[PDB]
Amino acid sequence: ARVKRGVVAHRRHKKILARAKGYYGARSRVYRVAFQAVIKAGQYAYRDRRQKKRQFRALWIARINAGARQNGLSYSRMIDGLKKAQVIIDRRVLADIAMHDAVAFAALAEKAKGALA
Amino acid sequence: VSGGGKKPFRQKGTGRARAGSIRSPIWVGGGKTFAARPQDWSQKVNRKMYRGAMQCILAELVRQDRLVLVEEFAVAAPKTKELLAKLNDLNAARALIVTDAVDENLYLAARNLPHVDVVDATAIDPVSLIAFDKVVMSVAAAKKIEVELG
RNA sequence: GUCAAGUAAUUAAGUGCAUGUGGUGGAUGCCUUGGCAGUCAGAGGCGAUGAAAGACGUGAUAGCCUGCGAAAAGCUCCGGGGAGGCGGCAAAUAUCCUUUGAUCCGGAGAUGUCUGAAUGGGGGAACCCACCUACUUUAAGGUAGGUAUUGCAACAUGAAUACAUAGUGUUGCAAGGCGAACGAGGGGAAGUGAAACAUCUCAGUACCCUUAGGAAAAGAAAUCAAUUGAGAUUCCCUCAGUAGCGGCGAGCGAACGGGGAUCAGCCCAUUAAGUUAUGUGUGUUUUAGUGGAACGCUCUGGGAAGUGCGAACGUAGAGGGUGAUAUUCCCGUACACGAAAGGGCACACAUAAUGAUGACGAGUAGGGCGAGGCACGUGAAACCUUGUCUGAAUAUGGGGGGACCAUCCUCCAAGGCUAAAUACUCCUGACUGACCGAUAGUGAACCAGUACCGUGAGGGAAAGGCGAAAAGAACCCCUGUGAGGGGAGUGAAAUAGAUCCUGAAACCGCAUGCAUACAAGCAGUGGGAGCACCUUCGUGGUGUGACUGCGUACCUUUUGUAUAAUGGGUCAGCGACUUAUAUUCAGUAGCGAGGUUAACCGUAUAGGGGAGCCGUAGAGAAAUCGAGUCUUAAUAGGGCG
RNA sequence: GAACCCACUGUCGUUGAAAAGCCAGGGGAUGACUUGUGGAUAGGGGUGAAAGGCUAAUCAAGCCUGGUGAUAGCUGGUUCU
RNA sequence: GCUAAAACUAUGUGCCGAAGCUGCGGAUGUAUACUUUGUAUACGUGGUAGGGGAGCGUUCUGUAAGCCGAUGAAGGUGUGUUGAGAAGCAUGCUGGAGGUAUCAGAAGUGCGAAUGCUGACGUGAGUAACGACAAAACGGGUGAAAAACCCGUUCGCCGAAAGACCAAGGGUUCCAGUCCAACGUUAAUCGGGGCUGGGUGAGUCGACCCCUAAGGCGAGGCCGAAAGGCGUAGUCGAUGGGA
RNA sequence: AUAGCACUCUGCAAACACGAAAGUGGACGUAUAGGGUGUGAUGCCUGCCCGGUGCUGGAAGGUUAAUUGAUGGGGUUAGCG
RNA sequence: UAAGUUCCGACCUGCACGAAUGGCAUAAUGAUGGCGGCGCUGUCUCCAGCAGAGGCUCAGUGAAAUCGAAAUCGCUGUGAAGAUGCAGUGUACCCGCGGCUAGACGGAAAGACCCCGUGAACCUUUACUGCAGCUUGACACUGAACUUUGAUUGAGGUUCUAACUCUGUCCCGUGAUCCGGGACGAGGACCGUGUCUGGUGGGUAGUUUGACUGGGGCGGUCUCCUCCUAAAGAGUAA
RNA sequence: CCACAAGUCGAGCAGGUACGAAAGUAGGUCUUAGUGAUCCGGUGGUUCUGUAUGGAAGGGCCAUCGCUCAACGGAUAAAAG
RNA sequence: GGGAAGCCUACCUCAAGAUAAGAUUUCCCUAGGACUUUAUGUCCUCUAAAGAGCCGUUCGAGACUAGGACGUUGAUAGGUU
Numbered sequence A: 001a002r003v004k005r006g007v008v009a010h011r012r013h014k015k016i017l018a019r020a021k022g023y024y025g026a027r028s029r030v031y032r033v034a035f036q037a038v039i040k041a042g043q044y045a046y047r048d049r050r051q052k053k054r055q056f057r058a059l060w061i062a063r064i065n066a067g068a069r070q071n072g073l074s075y076s077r078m079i080d081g082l083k084k085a086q087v088i089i090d091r092r093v094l095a096d097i098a099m100h101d102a103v104a105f106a107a108l109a110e111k112a113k114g115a116l117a
Numbered sequence B: 001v002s003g004g005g006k007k008p009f010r011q012k013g014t015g016r017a018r019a020g021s022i023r024s025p026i027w028v029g030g031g032k033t034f035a036a037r038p039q040d041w042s043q044k045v046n047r048k049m050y051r052g053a054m055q056c057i058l059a060e061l062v063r064q065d066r067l068v069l070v071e072e073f074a075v076a077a078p079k080t081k082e083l084l085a086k087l088n089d090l091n092a093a094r095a096l097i098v099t100d101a102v103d104e105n106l107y108l109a110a111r112n113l114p115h116v117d118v119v120d121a122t123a124i125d126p127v128s129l130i131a132f133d134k135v136v137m138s139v140a141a142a143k144k145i146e147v148e149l150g
Numbered sequence C: 001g002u003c004a005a006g007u008a009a010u011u012a013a014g015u016g017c018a019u020g021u022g023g024u025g026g027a028u029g030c031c032u033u034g035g036c037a038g039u040c041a042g043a044g045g046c047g048a049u050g051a052a053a054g055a056c057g058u059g060a061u062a063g064c065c066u067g068c069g070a071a072a073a074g075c076u077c078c079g080g081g082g083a084g085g086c087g088g089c090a091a092a093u094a095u096c097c098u099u100u101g102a103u104c105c106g107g108a109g110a111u112g113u114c115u116g117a118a119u120g121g122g123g124g125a126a127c128c129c130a131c132c133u134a135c136u137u138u139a140a141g142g143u144a145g146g147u148a149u150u151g152c153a154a155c156a157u158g159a160a161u162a163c164a165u166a167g168u169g170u171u172g173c174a175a176g177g178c179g180a181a182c183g184a185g186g187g188g189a190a191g192u193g194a195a196a197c198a199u200c201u202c203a204g205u206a207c208c209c210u211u212a213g214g215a216a217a218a219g220a221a222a223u224c225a226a227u228u229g230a231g232a233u234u235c236c237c238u239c240a241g242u243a244g245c246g247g248c249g250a251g252c253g254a255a256c257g258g259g260g261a262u263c264a265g266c267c268c269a270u271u272a273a274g275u276u277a278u279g280u281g282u283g284u285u286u287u288a289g290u291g292g293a294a295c296g297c298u299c300u301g302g303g304a305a306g307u308g309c310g311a312a313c314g315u316a317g318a319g320g321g322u323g324a325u326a327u328u329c330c331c332g333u334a335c336a337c338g339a340a341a342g343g344g345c346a347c348a349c350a351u352a353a354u355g356a357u358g359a360c361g362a363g364u365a366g367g368g369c370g371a372g373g374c375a376c377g378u379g380a381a382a383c384c385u386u387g388u389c390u391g392a393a394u395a396u397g398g399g400g401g402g403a404c405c406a407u408c409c410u411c412c413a414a415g416g417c418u419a420a421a422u423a424c425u426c427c428u429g430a431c432u433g434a435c436c437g438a439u440a441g442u443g444a445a446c447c448a449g450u451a452c453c454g455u456g457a458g459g460g461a462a463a464g465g466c467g468a469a470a471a472g473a474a475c476c477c478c479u480g481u482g483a484g485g486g487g488a489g490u491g492a493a494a495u496a497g498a499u500c501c502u503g504a505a506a507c508c509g510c511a512u513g514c515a516u517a518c519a520a521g522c523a524g525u526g527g528g529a530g531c532a533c534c535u536u537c538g539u540g541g542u543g544u545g546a547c548u549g550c551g552u553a554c555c556u557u558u559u560g561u562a563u564a565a566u567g568g569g570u571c572a573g574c575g576a577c578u579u580a581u582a583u584u585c586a587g588u589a590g591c592g593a594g595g596u597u598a599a600c601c602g603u604a605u606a607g608g609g610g611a612g613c614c615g616u617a618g619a620g621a622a623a624u625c626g627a628g629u630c631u632u633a634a635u636a637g638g639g640c641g
Numbered sequence D: 001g002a003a004c005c006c007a008c009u010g011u012c013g014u015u016g017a018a019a020a021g022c023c024a025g026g027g028g029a030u031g032a033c034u035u036g037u038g039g040a041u042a043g044g045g046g047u048g049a050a051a052g053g054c055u056a057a058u059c060a061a062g063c064c065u066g067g068u069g070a071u072a073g074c075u076g077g078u079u080c081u
Numbered sequence E: 001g002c003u004a005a006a007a008c009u010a011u012g013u014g015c016c017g018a019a020g021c022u023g024c025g026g027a028u029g030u031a032u033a034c035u036u037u038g039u040a041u042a043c044g045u046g047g048u049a050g051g052g053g054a055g056c057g058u059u060c061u062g063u064a065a066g067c068c069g070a071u072g073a074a075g076g077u078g079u080g081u082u083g084a085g086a087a088g089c090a091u092g093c094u095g096g097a098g099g100u101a102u103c104a105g106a107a108g109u110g111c112g113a114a115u116g117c118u119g120a121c122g123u124g125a126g127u128a129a130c131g132a133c134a135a136a137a138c139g140g141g142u143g144a145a146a147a148a149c150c151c152g153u154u155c156g157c158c159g160a161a162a163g164a165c166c167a168a169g170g171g172u173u174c175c176a177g178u179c180c181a182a183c184g185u186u187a188a189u190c191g192g193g194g195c196u197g198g199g200u201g202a203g204u205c206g207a208c209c210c211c212u213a214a215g216g217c218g219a220g221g222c223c224g225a226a227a228g229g230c231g232u233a234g235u236c237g238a239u240g241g242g243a
Numbered sequence F: 001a002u003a004g005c006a007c008u009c010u011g012c013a014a015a016c017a018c019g020a021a022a023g024u025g026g027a028c029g030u031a032u033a034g035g036g037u038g039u040g041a042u043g044c045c046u047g048c049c050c051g052g053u054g055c056u057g058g059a060a061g062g063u064u065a066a067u068u069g070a071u072g073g074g075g076u077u078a079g080c081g
Numbered sequence G: 001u002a003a004g005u006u007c008c009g010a011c012c013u014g015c016a017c018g019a020a021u022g023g024c025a026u027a028a029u030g031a032u033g034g035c036g037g038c039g040c041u042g043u044c045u046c047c048a049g050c051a052g053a054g055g056c057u058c059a060g061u062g063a064a065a066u067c068g069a070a071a072u073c074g075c076u077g078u079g080a081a082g083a084u085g086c087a088g089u090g091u092a093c094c095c096g097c098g099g100c101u102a103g104a105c106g107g108a109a110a111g112a113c114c115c116c117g118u119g120a121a122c123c124u125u126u127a128c129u130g131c132a133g134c135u136u137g138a139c140a141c142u143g144a145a146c147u148u149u150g151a152u153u154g155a156g157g158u159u160c161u162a163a164c165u166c167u168g169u170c171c172c173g174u175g176a177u178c179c180g181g182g183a184c185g186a187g188g189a190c191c192g193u194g195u196c197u198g199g200u201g202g203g204u205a206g207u208u209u210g211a212c213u214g215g216g217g218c219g220g221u222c223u224c225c226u227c228c229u230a231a232a233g234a235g236u237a238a
Numbered sequence H: 001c002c003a004c005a006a007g008u009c010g011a012g013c014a015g016g017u018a019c020g021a022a023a024g025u026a027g028g029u030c031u032u033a034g035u036g037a038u039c040c041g042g043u044g045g046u047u048c049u050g051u052a053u054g055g056a057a058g059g060g061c062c063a064u065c066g067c068u069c070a071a072c073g074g075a076u077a078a079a080a081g
Numbered sequence I: 001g002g003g004a005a006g007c008c009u010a011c012c013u014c015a016a017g018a019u020a021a022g023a024u025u026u027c028c029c030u031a032g033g034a035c036u037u038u039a040u041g042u043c044c045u046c047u048a049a050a051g052a053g054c055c056g057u058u059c060g061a062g063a064c065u066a067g068g069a070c071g072u073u074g075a076u077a078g079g080u081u
């Protein structure tokens, strides 16, 4: 029962090379190089699925800081005021409002100042 | 493998990977790493286990109605068509026939029929009891099988 | 309108990615006039009447292969067969042959150059040189035969030396050489293991030498056993990894008894069984061959054996081929017949020979010394063989029963022959494979032990596939009457067009879209604008990716590697925990205080075969006891149960 | 001091024209001389005006084929989820 | 970059900050109850050497005279889709004859590394080099094409060899016609290249022959487990003697 | 390496070397010859040591091999008990 | 010599000259070692010009070792401890050609030095254990006569021929320096060979020749008892 | 106490004994070092075994002897550079 | 306030790829249709300037390049005088 490896080996190599599409030079042509590139891409993606949440929260915080400073507060004081006022709107929605609706963000800042008073 | 007696090149200094024979199993055209030899594939079967399996097979055939008992089964001439007509009227066109003794005319008539075989009562085997669609057994053969107790 | 400040668009020498279309290369799939391993039945040799292996020649055209030998792809006779043929690569042409019987197949004859045991002498194999006799020619020849050595026999001849002998010659007979494995005999290692090494192991193995047969060797008790029993030799299962041997290490390793296979005894001087030749008779088998059943329509298609419908044969539904998958198209298959002539085997008779220079076993048994073989390494070492020195009794006698003695039991050495069961495969025929399918399987599917390498012994490759059929591309055009291509034509298909099925990857082009010439690093990843095409018009698809956070390959080896520590230029194909036996444990199945057969027989996975093995009792070194036993004066105590 | 036989110095060459050379100089050159042809000595052996030199570009034990798939407490490698 | 700090000491309010904790969705292991389950609760799920458990694919055997297939199999190449994964399924193009469910059974069953083996092809790079520094120039001819071939006129080099012979060794390379793919370190009309046809004439040259050296073999013979060693009579053996 | 020097062995079937043996070289030679060892033209020369190892010649006391086999001690049993 | 670790001559506390493993000299000789001088010069101060052959450009042919993949800068620091690739920072538009060798711990050869493996080979010897060779005695081949002497036996001496030796002469096979047979001559129970046995035996052969260890070697150590190190149970290393 | 092989302490029972009037004490010495496995053999005993049987040889069991095996868990009977 | 061969200038050469790409003088180009993607928009037709280069003769410039001079309205090179 002699077994020839050609068909299955070719399928596996072709699948790896297909996942390596778009890479530079030997990384999209040569199996030994392409296989390392795919694994490292997977490792990077696993790490960056965690990094993405941090980066987007940092962006929301920066935009909220800009809005609060336009309304006469700092970010930390505005967050403290909202907590004391019991408002539980999260930073993603707060930054969306800060970017797209200035009047509503002004109202939120006024509520935060009123609670801080 | 033919040849391969001498060391292909010296151990050190050439820059090659070290080699001891051109018939190494690593090399193309070399020996097979674990060369096969003729093997015996027979297994031991306990006498009681074989008899029990045969009894189970016969009982299951009776339960599934694939065993057909007939008082007598014989043909008057070594003609295929006569046996074919007999099997057709028995509604056993694909069958293993079991007889107390195999008549020469029956053997000759059954030789060329596909899906039909004829055997003696002392020559049944578990594979043939299962492979054929039906088993047509004469009463004398059934009693001999009973005496043999499966 | 001018100036100023600010800020878009616009380039690609080249490059990246994606897609399309190619080139190179020959993977993959499918295939096979080639290999691998067996079963059954035969056969087991060829050679001085010149072998194995070769050289040279032989054809209308003749290079190689095959055949053959100056009578040269062949001659004669007999038999078979009945429409074609002049061997293959390898077409084509010419001469031809053939129903007055060709080619072809089988049997028997004829011819059969040179070398090679080579044998008239010599020699660097395929060459050089001869002698004698008979016949024939007239010129410097031709035809036929003889001329090696050794051994044996007969005859003749014949020294020192008188008889003789040695020696010499002639005639007749025989031998030599080659080739697979198995047999018998003469010599005989080391690597390795002992975790070193010398005893020991490896192992009487590898190798060298001599020499048979279809088998060989052995064989009919101076043998075992130990209720006085068995009854020649050989092979298998068990006894049993037991008893023993062993720097008591590593290891080596029986026998008795039991179960099977096969069975057989006969002789020593008027001389047996048996064996071998020859001749005759009978039987069987083998080497050519003959006949041999039964299918149509329809659809798809280049082509039907495939679809649909309905028939026929089957003692034939094995297999192969035919334009795709056929019981009924072809060759065959079951079955029924068949031999001028020759060969093999069996049986019977007849004649030779042989058995058979041998008539009961003396330089023998036994002993001292040194070695070898026995599972047994000097050991308490019996028994067998003998290099050396010795040396009986001879049936009122002698050998053995593992130091030795006595008693008992058993056998008769110093003379022979003998089938079967057993071992093997260079070969012949038939059949088979959970064996390979061109990097596999033989080194070799193909002009392979070739090409090539070496002074030589020796080593040793690569290389399969057009198409069903050559129908292998007439003719036109470019070009050098080249190569190559574009048309035309053939074909189902020509991107099947000649190193031609399929046509992967590395690697190399061309075309289109986007990005890219102020910006520093494992080349990605998470975000993300713009552009091009598509569109179900979007919260959509495809390609690209300005700008931006993070981010020093993989394997191995290490306390620890981005490491400037190892390995990899890349792709494709191959490449490493197997097989047999024994043993222990787990799972599962049968049977259960029982379970199970081995060899072997067996128209054979069945059914027989109970010898043997494991379990059912332990204690003790052992004799012995035994649910106990050992220790001890102890019934105490204690150890194993 | 030419031929012939050697090989003391230097540059070049070192993937060479060459697996030991070219060029410029150098030594012997009637002798213990150089050389052709054909022979003898064979591996623990041969041969050596002696360097462990030479014995077919191989020498503190030639080459080939066998024991043989020697052994390696060492290094490397060991394939899908 | 920072000086009544963005430094140091003390005190206080907030906030940022991890794969820790919480929220939402999903998978899996163990236990406890449901007195079948595949439903709830609780507690777990980083891992080298290792140990245990469960699977995917590949070749072959039976199931299979079955099922799929020229209305197009395997293989190749794209696209879409499914699962936790090894992987599966469908389909466009190419291809042109095989493939094979399910459940069992056997293994030449999975490659990136071993300075692994075989073939193909890259980088270096159109880079080094084109083999004695005796040396070339022009006119005409042929030819598709002339620095290299032919003819002619000049120039230069060797001349104790770079000329003329023999032996050894090689084996057709010799001569003529014809061709230029490969070979020739460039081109080539040329060639020691391909193809076709010719060519070697002996009493006196050489070999053969007669003769012997070193040495080889060796009837008998002597010696040795065998193979074999040596050697007498002889017989070969030129590098020497013989018209 | 060498001419020269010295020591030593060898009476011929020489010592010595090759070989398993037969046989062969030494040598168709014969101590003015042949082998081994050291020194190294020539000039002048070459001192002391025999305790050690070796070699040569003595000696017949001690020790010691095979071989030979005197004695002593056991095993077995006719018999006596 | 301006300046002399070399050279020449001399001195003698010669680490550690010395007489055939020769001592001290010695004419001639040596591609032999050391030192000095004349002449001469690109050896040099210090290089310049020129000739030929490459280099460079064009046309034709067309290699090599290497190579995980590359979008392949400097500095300071960090870090498997000497960074193109990490951190901070500086500089820098894209691509050739002629040169160059500071780095890529550049290429080349699984370091030859060092250590390790219960590895190898060859050589040496008063390492161990065998064997060849040489040698001793006993028995055998091996016999006959006289004699003398030692503590029944042993030993010795002198003759002889008939076993045996002759690489001595003659004859024959025989055309023959082998061999065989015959006849002599000289030897002779010696020599020599077989079995056993003591001695000798690097001629030859197989092997052995420890470990710990701030590398290895040298030195020290290797088993047992007591105290401390030993951190108030036991145990605990150099 | 301890990987194993080993090592250490021990009340109490039986027999025989010594010293004490007796209750009693004594299985070496105030304790902890003064040591060597296995194999192979020697010696004294023994109601074991005994290759046909009776014996015997040999073996077993109990007691005891022979290692500076000191590289002291000791690779060989036997080894330097 | 003074105060050094030291620092910045000053002297020589290079220098706007100084992407912050600077400044000054002078010179050149001013035409019509169609359409939809109404825009430095896409196809037509007509125009080809100032200059730069190819090529040639060359150099006190040069590996190739680059740089300088000249090309008949001419002394750029060779020749001639």
Ligand SMILES: NCCC[C@H](N)CC(=O)NCCC[C@H](N)CC(=O)NCCC[C@H](N)CC(=O)N[C@@H]1[C@H](O)[C@@H](OC(N)=O)[C@@H](CO)O[C@H]1NC1=N[C@@H]2C(=O)NC[C@@H](O)[C@H]2N1
Residues within 6 Å of the ligand: C470, C473, C487, C498
């Ligand atoms: N629009 C464009 C048009 C352009 C215009 N036209 C001009 C143009 O430009 N034209 C180009 C021309 C193309 C090309 N140049 C022509 C060419 O090449 N001819 C080659 C001619 C010679 C050829 N070498 C011969 C050859 O090889 N024989 C083979 C050979 O012996 C052998 O094969 C192997 N294995 O070795 C054998 C295998 O058994 O088979 C043989 N052969 C067989 N055949 C047979 C068959 O089929 N059955 C039966 C049996 O007879 C078979 N054997």
